Write a protein that binds this ligand. Sequence first.
Ligand SMILES: [Zn+2]
Ligand SMILES: [Zn+2]
Ligand SMILES: [Zn+2]
Lengths: 86, 82, 127, 137, 101, 146
Amino acid sequence: GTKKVGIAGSFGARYGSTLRKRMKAVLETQRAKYICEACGKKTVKREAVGIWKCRSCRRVFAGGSYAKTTPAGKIFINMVKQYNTK
Amino acid sequence: SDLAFPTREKVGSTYKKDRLYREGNGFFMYVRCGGCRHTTCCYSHSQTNISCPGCGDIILTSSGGRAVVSPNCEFKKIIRNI
Amino acid sequence: SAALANMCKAINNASRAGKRQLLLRFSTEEMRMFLLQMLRHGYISGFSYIHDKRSGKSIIDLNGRLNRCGAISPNYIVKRDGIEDFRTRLLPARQFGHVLFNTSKGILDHKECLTENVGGKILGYFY
Amino acid sequence: PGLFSANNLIKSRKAKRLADTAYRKRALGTKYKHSVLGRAPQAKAIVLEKIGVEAKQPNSAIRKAVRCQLIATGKKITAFVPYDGSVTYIESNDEVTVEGFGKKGRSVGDIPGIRFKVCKVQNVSLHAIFTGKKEKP
Amino acid sequence: MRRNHGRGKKNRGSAGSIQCDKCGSVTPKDKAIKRFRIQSLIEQASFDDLKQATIYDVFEVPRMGYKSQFCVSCACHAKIVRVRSSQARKIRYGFNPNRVA
Amino acid sequence: AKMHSSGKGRSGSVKPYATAFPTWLTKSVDEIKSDVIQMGNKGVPAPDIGTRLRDEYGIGKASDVLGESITRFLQRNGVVPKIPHDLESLVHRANTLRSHLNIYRKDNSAKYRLILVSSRMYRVARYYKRKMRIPGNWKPKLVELN
RNA sequence: AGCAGCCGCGGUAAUACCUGCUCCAAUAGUGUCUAUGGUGGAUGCUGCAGUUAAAAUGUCCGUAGUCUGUGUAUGUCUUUGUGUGUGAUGUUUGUGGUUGUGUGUGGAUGUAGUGAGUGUGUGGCAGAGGACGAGGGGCACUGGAUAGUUGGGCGAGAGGUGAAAUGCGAAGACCCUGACUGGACGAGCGGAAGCGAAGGCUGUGCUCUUGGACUAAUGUUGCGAUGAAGGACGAAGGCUAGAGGAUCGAAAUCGAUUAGAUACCGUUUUAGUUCUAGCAGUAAACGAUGCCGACUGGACGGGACAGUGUGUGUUGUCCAUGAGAAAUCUUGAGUAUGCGGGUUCUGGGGAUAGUAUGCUCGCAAGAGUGAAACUUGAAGAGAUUGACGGAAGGACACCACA
Ligand SMILES: [Zn+2]
Ligand SMILES: [Zn+2]
Ligand SMILES: [Zn+2]
């Protein structure tokens, strides 16, 4: 494989090394596969920015640009969920 | 005054593993519950809670040391036959 | 032979304090062969050992006559021609003291090993 | 130190020995690398200049020395001319035999920086010219 | 010099720090010099004039307690603590919480 | 003189010298054997069987009634667990730490415990392979860290 | 001018230089330069040192190896030294020569140790019982003080300093009052008290995890000690991304002080100080004090558990014996130069210098490993008596005050 460069190895030696590390971080979470919550199978992928879809059972939900959830979405999804229990 | 013949007061205040001849601290006992006359065999430092079958009760409970026999009960140390 | 060296330090401690008896909480087989060679030479009064299904116990009776005892680790191998160099290193004078070896005839001191034409492994000394 | 442990002891005691400086020059084979005369006990040289050096205080003096050229290796050195009024037998373009001082390669006394000593002057002993046994060259 | 090594700390690594009451420097809490005092709220050379001014028939003047905390430089300079000789350095003074009144 | 700490405690039991056979037994000797062999079928571990014999039957040393130790008696009656109780308690402790670390990552205290608990389990496995009680290629079945 | 291996001598009063006498040691010999054995228990197998003199590694885990658990001695024969140990022998004596006997490394074949796993369960580990702990991660709440915003009152200064200046105040400061917002912190109780491998850890209630001790007729049966190579954790400052911003504050800046202060003291104002995710890998990371095992006097305490007039594990202070160069040490810095319990690491006069160079790791800042040429007679530890302090006390005096 490659020691330090990973999925950013398609860029050769262009653009500078700080900018190729920003590409590598966001590209791993964007092209990964996630487990569905309705059917429980590992078949969720991204369609466009903010649209994630399951290839089996076809269900669509809304998330982040490059990751399925965002750090400020998790914070407020809990508050609504603690407020109902208490 | 030799070390091979210690007084029996000293043999009581010695650690269980420093005694001259191998000897521990536990023993088996008899217990009688209440009005009804049953008799069970128990251990002096039991780790289980026991209960009399007749007049269903709890006649022995465990602690950190010696097991605590109930208020209206009495024990007796078993002796073997010969 | 870790029990032989532990025993010799506890004996040096009591012989210096003026004790009469010594109780140790361990006892092995060759620790009792070393003690039986001090009794027949006059350096202790007697001893006795107990059986408890633990490491054992032993009680030594001191005399007033011992100057020192020791053990040598490791147990070097000495031919019958090298017996006499270990004697000049360990005993203060030429008239008393005993160096003990573990030979193919038992445990003997350095005078017997010369009258039987043998060598062995060194164990200790006392004077 | 068990009875079957002699390879652990040779490995351990050889490494401690290198902390001795005298032993370390011999073991690594670098005892004659930085030395102006190598393995000789004496050496010849031709005299370039004739200088005077101050003593190191608390001594007041001026010790007479010469700057030479080693015929065997072409290195420059300074040497000290011992006795009284003896620096005036030598001239320039004279040949001279020098040897050590006797203290392992350090300077001796109040003479700073000089590690050698003139011994002969054109094949005549310098100590014999001073006592009157031989005649100047 | 001392077997304390200068502070009352045993068998722990770190022990918390405080800021001195006079200069404000950072010090361990076990090394600082600490003093406790109970002062009357009104001065003693003013009690007579206060007994004619009071309107209540029975009055008790209040008292407050204060704990102080200084560093070695600030206590030595202010003479809260003085230099002692080699043997007198070992004398400790206490409080005895079991005193009767 | 503990293995992974500097503890030096001496607590513990001391069995008698030269015991005998119990007279105060209420049941039979053949009715007791068929119960020690029953609890071994329900999966009760052998240190816990000896605690029922002592507390409820009056048997202080089962080598005087069964004729041998507890885990050699169960062997002749065809009850041989797949792994001994010593080794399998240690696999189980190392799985409950591995699944706590999957939710709470910053527990550096439990991450240090997982190292010591688990090197103690590879030492006990190496002993049972020298002695031919488990295969030479046995591997522990472990939750997978993330 | 010269001498002097080293210590040292010589400035018109040289036992030390130059010259003359006299004497000393060895003697056909006696001095110098260079290499090397001893000297050196200053390389330490026998046989050193490591609290402060040079030196125990920041902390645990762990493979090879060593040790523990379950390779020997000796008779007879044989094969090899020119050297040497030790007798005899008047080359006129002698170094010698001649001449008797012993010895050096491996192998073969007997004898002795030598008999073998058993049984038991002493170290460890695993499980039980009731207690104890500021051990750790997460969640939910809470307490006041600093700062600020905004309603009401008052009417000239407030702040801070050795003393002041810059700077803030009649668009109402400071002080007293009703409401709010925000970050950080967790006082007093709080100690020669507890817990954690160490770094470290003090509001309350829940939850998931954790440790050592104690108590016992539970299971197993030696499964262990130390540990180059390898691995994880690791104060504060720093660095990379996001969030946040009360207080304090490097750098910068003015005002003082001063001979001058780019400083101590102060005003304006920042990075940083906090949280999440990581990198880095250092400290007077200190008790400047490897780990495991055996044995050893008193007095007064604390903390946990169990018992009943005591025990086990830990721990603070003070006295002997003993030890030490001393200061001092008391579960050790004790157990004899009377020197050997198992197993590691580090030091070998000072300075050059933790510097060059090579290599491994890091975004960097740097960390780890680590010399020589050249220089030099001391550098250092602990204690003694003096002299001094812009050191502290107690006495005193109209050449001190009242
Ligand atoms: Zn689906
Ligand atoms: Zn009943
Ligand atoms: Zn202060």
